[PDB]
Design an enzyme around this catalytic site. Structure first.
Site, PDB file in Angstrom:
ATOM      1  N   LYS A   8      42.014  35.529  42.047  1.00 45.99           N
ATOM      2  CA  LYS A   8      40.766  35.358  41.319  1.00 45.99           C
ATOM      3  C   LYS A   8      40.833  36.068  39.976  1.00 45.99           C
TER       4      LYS A   8
ATOM      5  N   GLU B   7      33.870  45.377  39.020  1.00 39.85           N
ATOM      6  CA  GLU B   7      35.289  45.335  38.712  1.00 39.85           C
ATOM      7  C   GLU B   7      35.814  46.764  38.715  1.00 39.85           C
ATOM      8  N   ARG B   8      37.137  46.904  38.772  1.00 41.53           N
ATOM      9  CA  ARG B   8      37.733  48.231  38.839  1.00 41.53           C
ATOM     10  C   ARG B   8      37.575  48.961  37.512  1.00 41.53           C
TER      11      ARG B   8
END
EC number: 7.1.2.2
Lengths: 47, 469, 501, 188, 486
Positions: free
Chosen positions: B154, B180-181
């Protein structure tokens, strides 16, 4: 219920593992065939 | 009035305000906290203290903490002006650049597109993607759900597609790292710096940065849905530019409202979600898109965490996903790169009235051929290609070749995939499809078609193999 | 709700007006003495998540809060607790002494030693209330980390600051995996490069007293424990205790790595952390979820995992590294901990205890581990070898279940997989690893039977070391593609293998 | 954790906790009769219809409720324990359920006064002289402190006999019950 | 203060409306709040009534004095919306404005009794070959529609409507009927396409708009069953044959689920409460024909069933089966296997009955279905294919021919008699020599040849409804020319 097409292969168990391995064997036979044919065709186009 | 800390296990707080409870969507700041702590009034419990949705860490608060009552949702400026920095939904520019102040500022709680005033057509928003064009061409500004998993390509396919399209957005654009990271945040910052569609110092920002990171708790991580809806409305009018929107990921986001429901004591859904978590998420899907003065080519990621294909979360996902992007993580396990679930994803631009009779018919025949591939695969698993019928062994080779021609290694992927990207032409794709229908490499190995662009490029690759053999 | 003080316990002094003297900021009576779920008479002016100190010294972690009653945490086995007890709320976010004086000292999260090595010598007390790194503060990091196992460094290159997640269930050598990493992390930490010299962190949650003592014997035997931090939450580790032990690691990593320590934290398992926090919430009667577990463990565990930052130039330049090891229930990928980590991890390792069931020890779940970090933190020489090795092992697996040329390929790949194996507790430098990698890329013994190769590999490492230990250090320090060391390797390979028969 | 003066009667519920607290409060100075009269009076004093309406008014501030309550209690010149108890109950919102607590405390103070329960029922009501005679009859069963507080009753539904509840003793001489036993026998 | 027919918001949150007052207000009425929010309460507490926010009540702060208007759910009646796009709140759907519908029919509509029922005999305009072939829908039928994501369910519906709208645009005295079909839980783009095509397919000529949006209120989703029930009853008691389409159905289930959940009512299995029987069957059981006494109208219903990974055991599906007088099993893999229509035929079933079956089409289906089963009986053998028993091979070819004919065209309704003729030609064995890959285009071309020439014989059979052996032979020869000449 319903049964899938390749339902076992969908599950892919030891039966599916065999499916993969036999795909390997037969497709590799055909691949050596196609590759040898291509080598022959290249040999033909060389002249 | 002004709420005062009363009694709460954290953010599930009814703060004692001298007057009553403000109107709905009220988001008020905690006066007396470490930072600007805006809490959203959410429970019309009365009692001059409404159990309010606090997005911030409650630690350190002392009961009686008198807080600043605002009365409505967060207001920050919008429009293509704010583009260029990275700002919070509260407006907090977290680009280490202070307030990237724009013009169009307003609250976030609003209605959906009108029953008569939106856009009523679908235009194939082609990008030249091997698999996507091959079967499921997209369209303009629709609800396209990216059915993929975690670490399941993804973000990888996202990088490939960003490299592909994002550099040339129709107007400005937006991207959200919703959970998100933080490492991915810094990497994406370096990537935007090296990407030019949005430029850090330069005003090349045809894109908009947004972060809802995982280390950011749900109180924010669950809240940026309205921020994205408003940003899309701005790109429709205020930013007013043909904008595709990136937002990832929503699984932890809808799950985040779910986790919030417990503090709300709200009823656990089948996956324990809020009973109206679906109500919001569907409504969240209804806010801003292609309209008369509206346009959002928003890309929607459909995270299927735990690969649960029939997830109630996936259920709501399919519920409004005007376009489907079904990954086949099994295919990727088989080494597919692209690896989508082929006979599964749905897209309207794959129709004889839309794709054209030829293209739609070809795609459907491909689906049938792959279905036979699967079917006979187990059949072989029983017997094997020893009994491979003339129609069958032919079908076997053809299906293997179709699978091979399906994938391609990208240039951003060439970081790992080694092979740089192949800008697949639509006509080239259809031509390779027709040729494969004919059998364009019957004497040749399909492995060349694997991870390849044009079918002619694959013929070249097979010749290269003939050299390397 | 149940009127807690609706009894004359406070209501008597209320109607009699006798209650006014109660310390109502950071002390008082126990509004509820029960099950360690502590409600305090007053102390409403106490900070949230603040520290509470009972009059019996017991520490209290007030999380839930009635207006003056609370939910606080009995930091101990409170068999002596009393009604209306006095908790002088310390009013502070939890902190405890930090400093590499702990590196080589076995204390608890609060700095409490259990092995008799003395009081917490770690310097300063750090409140674990640490948030995520900043976009300016954080940047891409790709430096190598101590892997020391052939395939480990091979396909899942160890990044200085990379946060691992190693799937391996009950009795899957997960502890053995950690020990192997430590032995690998030993020679790195046993190095003069302060970046390599790692004063680092490693722990196994639920490490009972016997487990703790055995692990201590091992780590001290490794003597990397000197440059290491090791706390073992034994069988009585409190739900708050085990619960914040990861937070203890978080504060410790901020301390060293944020001060530029290229250092690693190894804590597991957060599934047990879920059990502890759920035990609390049950005692808290808080709303339960899947497996009764809270669905907000996402952000709670994110406070540790999602803040994954390898100390950049802004963060001191070291590394705040993590090495999670996942443990499947039954391969239950969708298990709350499992699905969550899947939903959480961006990169994760997987071990095939079925191959360990098949007997392989080690037995990493090939392919099933994820290294989205990639080879950017491995030797570019190791990177080059792995470029081929990936396809080699894939084909070895791709048609493992038996063309003759394809049969030759399968024989070579199977022999290579056999060669890649390693023993029990035998981590070392990646030099001999790259040596065997060159052997396989040359197929230096693919003609030697894997059973012949079984000893031929050891003989090869031996004759190479006796032949090119100098060239070994050469290729090591040089790192880059050493064609000269490559030809020396070809020669010494003819020596070791050809001279082995 | 007050060792609250449990009245001779013990109650339960929020009303019970309030009753124990009030028993402690009054017994501290033993104002049981005094505050008891105070409460008997307050039962109507607050029963001021507008007072009940404002208390029942959900649109009425609980703080304002306690304020108006303090005004009305000073108007009653409320006893100290009584006044602060009124304030505390208002804070709990117990004004909604205050009369029940009043009744409970009444039962507590009556049992403090040795409230020996009694209830006299039969196939009907009977002679007052026979009533005093049966009261004496129960008195021998009655004990120290047991003061005859009977609940006379007429019950033709009781086919016969006499249903005499006394404290805990329930002496139902009911010949309806005799009839039931007789029918049970008539089966066998 | 008010305590008889006006309440005052006591304590709320997420629209959880329980107000102080209106105790004497009647039960189940959509009444205006203090913000004028016309909304309905059901959870009449001893102290209050749980009122559902009829949509989003952000314009209602706490403490609001809601005036119980004593107004129950009342929705319009009459064919004024046939062709007009309207919403259930008296609003438009596509913004198609006032349908010229004035009235409003109170929620007090009950289902017809056995006497109020009418025997169903209408052969449904299905526009999908096997749809009419295996089992069309009676006058007021009740058949489930099992399907999945983008399953063509609405596409089968389009085939039906395209077969239906012609007579909806038409006048055939027995085909005069009313049409209304829900797009419940519909995306804005989807509903826009729906309205646009209804115009394009001319389905916006005689159809009363039904749909629940993705943003549609959960209470609106719930009333939508009642909404469609009253709407159908309008023309049904108006003697006009009517049609319902509970499309979808599960969404309103989850809706009322969330509703009672807020209400803290008991969840039940999958949090689904008994109203899945009670509320859902409350509309479902009415899927019949209003008696000649009840007007003679027919109340058709077309509920939509989402196969959540084929959740065959859905308590939703559970109630459905026990209620289904018919169901639509779809072999979606067949569409994925190219066979779209993806008919799960041996799986498909219909309990409505054949009282609405063209004895001509009935005669065709009698052999077509037997052949289909027999093909399916050994269709597994087809896999090997080789050494096929001549009887088995012929049975397969008939099945192979049918598989060629098995597909269907989106938004492509056709003449039912045309399908009857095609199946008749097959029964003649007249298709035995057509290559199946081309046999489809063959049948299509023969169809064109008839619709030009034997269109005379086509109307002959159609108006005839009786298969004259001579007319049968005439069609046979027309087809033989078309096919031998194909």
């Amino acid at each position: 219920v319903r049964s899938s097409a390749g339902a076992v292969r969908d599950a892919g168990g030891a039966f599916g593992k065999r499916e993969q391995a036999e795909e390997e064997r037969y497709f590799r036979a055909r691949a050596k065939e196609q590759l040898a044919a291509l080598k022959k065709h290249h040999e033909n186009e060389i002249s | 009035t002004t709420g005062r800390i009363v009694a709460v296990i954290g953010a599930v707080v009814d703060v004692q305000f001298d007057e009553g409870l403000p109107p709905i969507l009220n988001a008020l700041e905690v006066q007396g906290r470490e930072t600007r702590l805006v809490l959203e009034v959410a429970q019309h419990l009365g009692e001059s203290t409404v159990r309010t949705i606090a997005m911030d860490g409650t630690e350190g608060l002392v009961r009686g903490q008198k807080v600043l009552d605002s009365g409505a949702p967060i207001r920050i400026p919008v429009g293509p002006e704010t583009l260029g920095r990275i700002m919070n939904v509260i407006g907090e520019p977290i680009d280490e650049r202070g307030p990237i102040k724009t013009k169009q500022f307003a609250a976030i709680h609003a209605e959906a597109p009108e029953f008569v005033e939106m856009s009523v057509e679908q235009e194939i928003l082609v990008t030249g993607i091997k698999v996507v064009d091959l079967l499921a061409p997209y369209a303009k500004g629709g609800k396209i759900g990216l059915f993929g998993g975690a670490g399941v390509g993804k973000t990888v396919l996202i990088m490939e597609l960003i490299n592909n399209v994002a550099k040339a957005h129709g107007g400005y654009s937006v991207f959200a790292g919703v959970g998100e990271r933080t490492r991915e945040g810094n990497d994406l910052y370096h990537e935007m710096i090296e990407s030019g569609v949005i430029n850090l110092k330069d005003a090349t920002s045809k894109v908009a940065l947004v972060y809802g990171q995982m280390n950011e708790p749900p109180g924010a991580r669950a809240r940026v849905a309205l921020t994205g809806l408003t940003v899309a409305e701005y790109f429709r009018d205020q930013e007013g530019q043909d904008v595709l929107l990136f937002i990832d990921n929503i699984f932890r986001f809808t799950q985040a409202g779910s986790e919030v429901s417990a503090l709300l004591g709200r009823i656990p859904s089948a996956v324990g979600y809020q009973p109206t978590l679906a109500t919001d998420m569907g409504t969240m899907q209804e806010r801003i898109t292609t309209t008369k003065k509206g346009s959002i080519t928003s890309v929607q990621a459909i995270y299927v965490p735990a690969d649960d294909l029939t997830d109630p979360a996936p259920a709501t996902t399919f519920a409004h996903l005007d376009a489907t992007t079904v990954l086949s993580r099994a295919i990727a396990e088989l080494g597919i790169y692209p690896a989508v679930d082929p006979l599964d994803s749905t897209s309207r631009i794959m129709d004889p009235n839309i794709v054209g009779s030829e293209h739609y018919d070809v795609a459907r025949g491909v689906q049938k051929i792959l279905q036979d591939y699967k079917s006979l695969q187990d059949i072989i698993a029983i017997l094997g290609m020893d009994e491979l019928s003339e129609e069958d062994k032919l079908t076997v080779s053809r299906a293997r070749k179709i699978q091979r021609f399906l994938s391609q290694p990208f240039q951003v992927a060439e970081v790992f995939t080694g092979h740089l990207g192949k800008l697949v032409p639509l006509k080239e794709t259809i031509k390779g499809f027709q040729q494969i229908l004919a059998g364009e490499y019957d004497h040749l190995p399909e492995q060349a078609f694997y991870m390849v662009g044009p079918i002619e490029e694959a013929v070249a690759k097979a010749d290269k193999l003939a050299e390397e053999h | 709700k149940t009127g807690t003080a609706e009894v004359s316990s406070i209501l008597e002094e209320r109607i009699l007006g006798a209650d006014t003297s109660v310390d109502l900021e950071e002390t008082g009576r126990v509004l509820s003495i029960g099950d360690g779920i502590a409600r305090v008479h007053g102390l409403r002016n106490v900070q949230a998540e603040e520290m509470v100190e009972f009059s019996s010294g017991l520490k209290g972690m007030s999380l839930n809060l009635e207006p003056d009653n609370v939910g606080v945490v009995v930091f101990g086995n409170d068999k002596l607790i009393k009604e209306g007890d006095i908790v002088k709320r310390t009013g502070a976010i939890v902190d405890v002494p930090v400093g590499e004086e702990l590196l080589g000292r076995v204390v608890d999260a609060l700095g409490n030693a259990i092995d008799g090595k003395g009081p917490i010598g770690s310097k300063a007390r750090r409140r674990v209330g640490l948030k995520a790194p900043g976009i300016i503060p954080r940047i891409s990091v790709r430096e190598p980390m101590q892997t020391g196992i052939k395939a480990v460094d091979s396909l899942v290159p160890i990044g200085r600051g990379q946060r691992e997640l190693i799937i391996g269930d009950r009795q899957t050598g997960k502890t053995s995996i950690a020990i192997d990493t430590i032995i690998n992390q030993k020679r790195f930490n046993d190095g003069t490069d302060e970046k390599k010299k790692l004063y680092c962190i490693y722990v196994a949650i639920g490490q009972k007293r016997s487990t703790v003592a055995q692990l201590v014997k091992r780590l001290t035997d490794a003597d990397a424990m000197k440059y290491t931090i090791v706390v073992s939450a034994t069988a009585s580790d409190a739900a708050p205790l085990q619960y914040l032990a990861p937070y203890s690691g978080c504060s410790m990593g901020e301390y060293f790595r944020d001060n530029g320590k290229h250092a690693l934290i190894i804590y597991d398992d957060l599934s047990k952390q879920a059990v502890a926090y759920r035990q609390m919430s049950l005692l808290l009667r808080r709303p339960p979820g899947r497996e009764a577990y809270p669905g907000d463990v996402f952000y709670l565990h994110s406070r540790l995992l999602e803040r994954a930052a390898k100390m950049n130039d802004a963060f001191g330049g070291g590394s705040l590294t993590a090495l999670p090891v996942i443990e499947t229930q039954a391969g239950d990928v969708s298990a709350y901990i499992p699905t969550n980590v899947i939903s959480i991890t961006d990169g994760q390792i997987f071990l095939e205890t079925e191959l360990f069931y098949k007997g392989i020890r080690p037995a990493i779940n090939v392919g099933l581990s994820v290294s989205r970090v990639g080879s950017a933190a491995q030797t570019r020489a190791m990177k080059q070898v792995a470029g081929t090795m990936k396809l080699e092992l894939a084909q070895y697996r791709e048609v493992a279940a038996f063309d003759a040329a394809t049969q030759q390929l399968l024989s070579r790949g199977v022999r290579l997989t056999e060669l890649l194996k390693q023993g029990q507790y035998s981590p070392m430098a990646i030099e001999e690893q790259v040596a065997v990698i060159y052997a396989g890329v040359r197929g230096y013994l693919d003609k030697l039977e894997p059973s012949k190769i079984t000893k031929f590999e050891n003989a090869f490492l031996s004759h190479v070391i006796s032949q090119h230990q100098a060239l070994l250090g050469k290729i090591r320090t040089d790192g880059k593609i050493s064609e000269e060391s490559d030809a020396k390797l070809k020669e010494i390979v003819t020596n070791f293998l050809a001279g082995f028969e | 954790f007050a060792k609250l003066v449990r009245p001779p009667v013990q109650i339960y519920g929020i009303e019970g906790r309030y009753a124990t607290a009030l028993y402690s409060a009054a017994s501290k100075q033993n104002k049981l009769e005094q505050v008891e009269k105070e409460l008997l009076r307050v039962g109507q004093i607050l029963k001021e219809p507008k007072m009940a309406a404002s208390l029942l008014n959900p649109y009425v501030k609980r703080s304002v409720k306690v304020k108006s309550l303090s005004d009305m209690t000073a108007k009653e010149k409320f006893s100290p324990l009584t006044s602060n108890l009124i304030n505390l109950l208002a804070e709990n919102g117990r004004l909604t359920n205050t009369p029940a607590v009043i009744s409970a405390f009444s039962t507590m103070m009556s049992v403090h006064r040795g409230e020996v329960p009694c209830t006299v029922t039969t196939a009907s009501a009977l002679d007052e002289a026979t009533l005093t005679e049966l009261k004496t009859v129960l008195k021998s069963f009655l004990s120290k402190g047991q003061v005859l507080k009977l609940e006379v009753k007429i019950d033709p539904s009781i086919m016969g006999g006499m249903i005499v509840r006394i404290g805990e003793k329930y002496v139902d001489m009911s010949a309806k019950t005799k009839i039931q036993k007789l029918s049970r026998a008539m089966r066998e």
